[PDB]
Amino acid sequence: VQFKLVLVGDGGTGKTTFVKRHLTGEFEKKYVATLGVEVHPLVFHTNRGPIKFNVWDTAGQEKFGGLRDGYYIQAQCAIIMFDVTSRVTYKNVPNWHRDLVRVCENIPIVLCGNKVDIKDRKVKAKSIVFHRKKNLQYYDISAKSNYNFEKPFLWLARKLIGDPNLEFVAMPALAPPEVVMDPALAAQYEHDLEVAQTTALPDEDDDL
């Protein structure tokens, strides 16, 4: 039960950071431009079963665009991403959209305005209307704060599975094993643990 999801938008808007948060739970602060595309599978557990997305995280910087619209072939859904701290990225949303629906003419598409965590917002809420005429779903999101991070995938999953009441459910939790530590490498986990103890956790001013 798997669906091809293409992710598009200008460079720097936070596409790869958004996926990676869903893959691993981490927040990558560095900007390493995506080269062509990166494919990751991503599974959600719903009350209607598991749904699997094959996420084609494509590249926003033109000089890294690779096959460009060639990535869109046979996509079943998509996310268009812009950055609400960068007006230029909203203004290009119509260009990504044009190129996406020339290849994929009838697929569910979400428009996501990322980085609403940043105090100085530039793309005002009232100004975000492109999606109305094109029947896109729209959400404010932040990959850094997780604000609404799940809503694009919950929406798409409802549209793909055909069930507006589909919800995410807790995966069942198998008993964990009773493993005793290895005395051969017990003198070794002094070091691995020393490093981690003296590396400071990121973002110590956060509420958590």
């Binding site: 560095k30 062509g36 060639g70 230029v88 009232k126 404010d140 110590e204």
Partner: protein, 1011 residues
């Protein structure tokens, strides 16, 4: 494995190997996929891959492989077409044409290869942009002709025309020069009569839906630009509004066509056109009622059910109705025979407005705001819409979104986590419409609200959702009623809401109802001001909630307190009748009791609200006494902590002491924020010891880095010591930015400040420098810089070079220093430019470097200040006129700024700054074309004008940077650009025309004569 073989072009291409790489990319996974991807990218990027295109299209069995071949041609056509020899051009044309014809005659390919035929049409369209009509003038005639040969070719011709209209009218601004865009637009316009014929015949004929839907999709595009006559002087509106509304195959595209038709503004004097605008609306609404849904249908349930394309049809319908009615409802409001039409349409909108779908609601709420604003001003309209407005009151009141202020929520009623900002704009838009609807009929709004309320008292309708949405609505209409009706309204509402918290017991009930009363009372300050006995009771009740164990209620009680005080402060400073003292006196006396269970942040808000009150007292002597009373606790704790720091300066080790100091300083910051200039006596009380404590904590931090390494700046202890330093800086900044007595700022504050902060900043290691030092200095320079020229010099010397070295190795480290640094250079450059003149020549050169380094950031905060500094700096040098410093400035730096500006304009990585980059460049060029540079810019024959040398420098500069341009392109560009250096808008157009030409070969040099 051996997938990389296709990258070797020595041999011929193994098509079957190509196809295996492709299917490994699309259909594979993991590493083989990731490796096939890199192979295909390298294959595509090869400047000769296009030659392999026709053999991939001839002999391949993979549609994806052919797609990728076409992407390779597209790249070649868009960027390098005119460098091809003419024979390859026609070969490529005839190949692409022939593959299209060939695919549209094979009924099986036509059905199953839609993606590949679309890609081919787009490729053909790329060839038209380059070749049509000047080297292909019969394209449109042949296309019309060939449309009779087949139904598959006619259908596909529509796709080509749709993609052509898009590329010419909808997406040409950014991708073509002005001149080329005009040329293709005029060419399409000239040949549209014929195109319309084909499209109108197809639509009347009526083959099958597949051709129809494509002809309509093309029509959607034409309507963005074609003349009104093609719509109103034919029978095409009757077709759209009737025939194609009935079939659901065509109904979606037709509605979108009718929305575009709507949106135009009609010639507002012709009775015929007006009647036609009415008729197509009347036809459309009859087909909806009869063939889709009657006006009573439950569109909320239909949309929730999400069968088929319902959700999209309802959205398109909402967009059609709102679009047409905002433009044209006046066509329906006077003729009595049009009244049911007007109202049925608005009745559909009432039903659309009950769907649960935020974004769809926002779309309809925008229309309702347009309506009710019109009805508040236009004479004789509102009675027409009375029953609509009555229904809208109920819709809005039952779907109020939670306001910012209401900090409780359900998951179990608990506290918020996050500032819902997708909700902030909605609430405001709901409030605005509801406030208008209350003006339009205040009696009906009250009756709705009081009855809904009567039916909560009864438990007849009780629930979290219902009492809340009602309460938020009741709050949101503050200021629409008369003071007298308000009086009786609020009384009733409060009486009823009090009854409700006594009935609904349990910890979750009482938190819901308490948040609702706080919201409501906080929203009616006019009432509170007039009913002092009630105001006093409200405040005492809020003080009570400050001891509540439910953290949501408690945090809300603090915010409600200061929200009330911002509006009613005057009533807390005067002595009220029947009161032994101003109420401020009672609040201050009891502050330790009132605030004892609050978190520190909430304590500081409480003190901030007391400062708002104290600043209402304008007798200086009485204000300063209130201020010292308010500050008694933090000042006794301060006087204690400072005798115990001076005697044996080591107690500050103590993590508890550190927290205590920071909260003292944060308390002063809170009170200073609301008292402003009036805070000065309190600041003077602590200033000298505070600056000594600053030096003392600075020593502690230094000594901990020294003993533990850089990692010490991550420890709780050192972050706490730095918090002390940051808060001291914030307090000083906060005071200085509101001070009215600048003479005291300079004579009392500034010198001890600079002695305390600047060397400590300069001689710390980089990871221990606080960027707040920079922010503090920026306010100092902003507010009194003009009075402290030697102080500004001193600031530069201490922070300029050492900060630059922190931030000039990449664009990412020390982000906050970066931003604060360019903010400080900006203010110094506009207010104390003399500081830069006394800079040594080496350091002035680092300053120019610093400005240019900012241009290259993508971080907009930095970039924009960089461009502004550069512009202001030019103005500053120009103002010196003809003197040595300015002439040596031009000799040394003029061409550095021209070329760096040109770099960021053309590298495609700094688009956000185009407008300011163009501004800077036009200023620079204009300096030379007004002989405001009184010195030769060169080291070339003597007597040469600076204008001639500038042209020469720039032609050489662009020739080496863009060697694929011809000399004539460059020369025409510079001629246009220099001629337009007093006309920013045209200058910008000319730069945009250049940015287009540098992306292709063979740009036409006459394009720069466009203006």
């Amino acid at each position: 494995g051996s997938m990389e073989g296709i990258l070797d072009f020595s041999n011929d291409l193994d098509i079957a190997l190509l196809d295996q790489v492709v299917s490994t990319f699309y259909q594979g996974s993991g590493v083989q996929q990731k490796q096939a991807q890199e192979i295909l990218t390298k294959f595509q990027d090869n400047p000769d891959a296009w030659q392999k295109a026709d053999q991939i299209l001839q002999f391949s069995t993979n549609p994806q492989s052919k797609f990728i071949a076409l992407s390779i041609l597209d790249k070649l056509i868009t960027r390098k077409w005119k460098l091809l020899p003419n024979d390859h051009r026609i070969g490529i044309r005839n190949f692409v044409v022939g593959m299209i014809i060939s695919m549209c005659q094979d009924d099986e390919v036509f059905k199953t290869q839609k993606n590949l035929i679309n890609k081919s049409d787009l490729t053909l369209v790329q060839i038209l942009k380059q070749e049509w009509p000047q080297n292909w003038p019969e394209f449109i005639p042949e296309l019309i002709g060939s449309s009779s040969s087949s139904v598959n070719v006619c259908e596909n011709n529509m796709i080509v025309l749709k993609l052509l209209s898009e590329e010419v009218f909808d997406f040409s601004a950014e991708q073509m020069t002005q001149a080329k865009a005009l040329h293709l637009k005029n060419s399409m316009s000239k040949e549209f009569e014929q195109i319309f014929k084909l499209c109108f015949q197809v639509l009347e004929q009526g083959s099958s839906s597949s051709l129809i839907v494509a002809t309509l999709e093309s029509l959607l595009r034409y309507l963005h630009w074609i003349p009104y006559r093609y719509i109103y002087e034919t029978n095409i509106l009757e077709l759209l509004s009737t025939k194609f509304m009935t079939s659901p195959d065509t109904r979606a595209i037709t509605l979108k066509c009718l929305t575009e038709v709507s949106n135009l503004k009609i010639p507002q004097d012709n009775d015929l056109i007006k009647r036609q605008t009415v008729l197509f609306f009347q036809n459309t609404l009859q087909q909806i009622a009869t063939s889709v849904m009657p006006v009573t249908a439950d569109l909320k349930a239909t949309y929730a059910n999400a069968n088929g394309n319902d959700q999209s049809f309802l959205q398109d319908l909402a967009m059609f109705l709102t679009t047409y009615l905002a433009r044209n409802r006046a066509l329906l409001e006077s003729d009595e025979s049009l009244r049911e039409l007007l109202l049925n349409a608005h009745q559909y909108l009432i039903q659309l407005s009950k769907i649960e779908e935020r974004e769809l609601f926002k779309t309809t709420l925008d229309y309702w705001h347009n309506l009710v604003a019109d009805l508040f001003y236009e004479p004789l309209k509102k009675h027409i819409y009375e029953e609509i407005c009555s229904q809208l009151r109920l819709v809005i009141i039952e779907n109020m979104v939670r306001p910012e202020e209401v900090l409780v929520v359900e998951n179990e009623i608990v506290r918020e986590f996050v500032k819902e900002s997708d909700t902030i704009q909605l609430y405001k838009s709901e409030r605005e419409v509801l406030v208008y609807l209350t003006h339009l009929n205040v009696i009906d709004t009250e009756e709705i609200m009081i009855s809904k309320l009567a039916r909560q008292i009864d438990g007849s309708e009780w629930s979290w959702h219902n009492i809340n949405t009602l309460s938020w609505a009741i709050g949101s209409i503050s200021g629409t009623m008369s003071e007298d009706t308000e009086k009786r309204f609020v009384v009733t509402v409060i009486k009823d809401l009090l009854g409700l918290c006594e009935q609904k017991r349990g910890k979750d009930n009482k938190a819901v109802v308490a948040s609702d009363i706080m919201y409501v009372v906080g929203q009616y300050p006019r009432f509170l001001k007039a009913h002092w006995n009630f105001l006093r009771t409200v405040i005492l009740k809020l003080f009570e909630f400050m001891h509540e164990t439910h953290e949501g209620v408690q945090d809300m009680a603090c915010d409600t307190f200061i929200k009330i005080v911002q509006k009613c402060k005057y009533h807390f400073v005067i002595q009220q009748p029947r009161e032994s003292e101003p109420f401020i006196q009672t609040i201050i006396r009891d502050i330790q009791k009132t605030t004892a269970d609050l978190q520190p942040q909430q304590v500081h808000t409480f003190y901030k609200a007391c400062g708002i009150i104290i600043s209402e007292e304008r007798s200086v002597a009485e204000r300063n006494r209130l201020l010292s009373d308010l500050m008694q606790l933090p000042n006794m704790a301060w006087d204690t902590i400072v005798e115990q720091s001076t005697a044996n300066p080591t107690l500050l080790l103590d993590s508890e002491t550190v927290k205590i100091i920071a909260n003292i300083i944060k308390t002063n910051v809170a009170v200073c924020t609301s008292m402003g200039a009036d805070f000065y006596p309190q600041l003077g009380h602590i200033y000298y010891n505070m600056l000594q404590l600053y030096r003392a904590v600075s020593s502690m931090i230094s000594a901990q880095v020294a003993a533990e390494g850089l990692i010490a700046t991550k420890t709780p202890k050192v972050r706490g010591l730095r918090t002390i330093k940051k808060e001291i800086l914030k307090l000083v900044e906060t005071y200085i930015s509101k001070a009215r007595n600048l003479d005291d700022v300079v004579k009392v504050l500034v010198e001890p400040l600079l002695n305390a902060v600047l060397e400590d900043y300069m001689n710390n290691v980089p990871d221990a420098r606080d960027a707040e030092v920079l922010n503090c200095m920026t306010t100092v320079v902003e507010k009194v810089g003009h009075m402290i020229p030697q102080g500004v010099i001193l600031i530069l010397q201490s922070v300029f070079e050492c900060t630059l070295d922190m931030i000039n190795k990449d664009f990412t480290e020390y982000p906050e220093h970066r931003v604060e640094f360019y903010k400080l250079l900006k203010v110094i450059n506009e207010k104390s430019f003399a500081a830069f003149l006394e800079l040594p020549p080496a350091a002035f050169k680092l300053f120019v470097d610093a400005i240019c380094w900012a241009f290259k950031h993508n971080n907009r905060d930095v970039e924009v200040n960089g461009l502004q500094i550069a512009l202001d700096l030019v103005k500053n040098i120009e103002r010196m006129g003809n003197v040595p410093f300015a002439n040596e400035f031009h000799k040394n730096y003029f061409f550095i700024f021209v070329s760096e500006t040109f770099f960021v304009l053309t590298d495609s990585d700094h688009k956000s700054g185009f407008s300011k980059q163009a501004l800077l460049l036009m200023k620079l060029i204009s300096l030379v074309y007004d002989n405001k540079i009184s010195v030769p810019l060169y080291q070339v024959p003597q007597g040469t004008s600076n204008q001639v040398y500038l042209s020469q420098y720039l032609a050489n500069m662009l020739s080496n940077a863009f060697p694929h341009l011809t000399s004539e392109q460059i020369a025409s560009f510079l001629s246009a650009l220099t001629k337009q250096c007093k006309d920013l808008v045209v200058f910008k157009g000319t730069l945009r025309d250049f940015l287009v030409q540098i992306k292709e070969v063979g740009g036409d040099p006459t394009d720069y004569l466009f203006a």
